């Protein structure tokens, strides 16, 4: 069918987006954790 | 080809 | 069947995207905690 052919790439496209977003978010979270480490040094 | 998260739960949650 | 290979395929992707959503939502909760800690520390150290 073609409703699921669409559903499939919709799902796969969204998945690749998650991977991209995740690595961006992880850089952001590491930054917050690093800032806390620095602030704790004081 | 599709990949899920590194862990099922986020570290620290 | 090609139809079955595509559906097994869709189910896998949907599951993985739902897992990513759960993971990311938990990260967002964790982030709120980090931001609160930073705010507290910044006023404590001035």
Q: For B1-13, b where at least 16 C-beta lie within 10 A, e where not — what string? A: ebebbeeeebeee
Cα A12 versus chain centre, distance? 15
Could you tell me the domains of chain A? 1-42 (1.20.5.1180)
Distance CA(A1)–CA(C16), nearest Å, equals: 22
The CA–CA distances, whole Å, from A29 to A3, A9, A15 equal 38, 30, 21
Which residue in chain C has the smallest CA separation from A37? C38
The closest alpha carbon to C4, from A31, A1, A14, belongs to A1
Q: Which chains touch A (3 or more CB pairs under 8 A)?
A: B, C
CB B7 within 8 A of CB C23: yes
Solved with: X-ray
The closest alpha carbon to B2, from C17, A2, A21, belongs to C17
Distance CA(A37)–CA(A31), nearest Å, equals: 10
Distance CA(A33)–CA(A40), nearest Å, equals: 11
The closest alpha carbon to C6, from A3, A12, A8, belongs to A8
Which residues in chain A have Cβ-Cβ distances shorter than 8 Å to C42? 39
């Amino acid at each position: 069918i073609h409703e699921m052919e669409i559903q499939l790439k919709d799902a796969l496209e969204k998945n690749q987006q998650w991977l991209v977003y995740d690595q961006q978010r992880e850089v952001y979270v590491k930054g917050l954790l690093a800032k806390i480490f620095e602030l704790e040094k004081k | 080809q599709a990949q899920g998260p590194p862990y099922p739960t986020y570290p620290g949650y």
